[PDB]
Amino acid sequence: MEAVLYSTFRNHLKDYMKKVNDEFEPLTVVNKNPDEDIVVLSKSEWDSIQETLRIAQNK
Amino acid sequence: MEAVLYSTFRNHLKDYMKKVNDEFEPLTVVNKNPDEDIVVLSKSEWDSIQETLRIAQNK
Q1: Which domain holds residue A24?
Q2: How many Å is the Cα radius of gyration of chain A?
C-alpha cells in the first residue's frame, strides 16, 4: 500500500483524496506517533468492502 | 458512521486522526464533489479488517 508522511498528506490533502477515488486504492498516512496512523480510501471502495462483506455473509 | 465536512476535517486533521485511533471507528469526509469523498480509519482497524478477511477465507 502507498505510504504517505503526515506532513505530505496535509500539504496535498485534496490531491490525495482525488487519488484514492480515481485509483480505487487506499493509502496509509505515516505519523511519528503510530497511534495517529490512518488509512484513507474512497467511500466507493469502502462501500465495496462493506457490501461484499454482507453479501458474502449471506452466501 | 460519523460524517465530517471537508473544511472541518482539514482544520482539525490531527484531532480526527487521534479520534479514529482512539475510538476504533471510521469516519467519512464529505465533499461538495462526491468523487472526492473518503473514509478515514486507523491502521489498526484496517489491519483488523484485512486479517479477518484472510482468516475467514482460510476457514
Answers
A1: 2-58
A2: 14
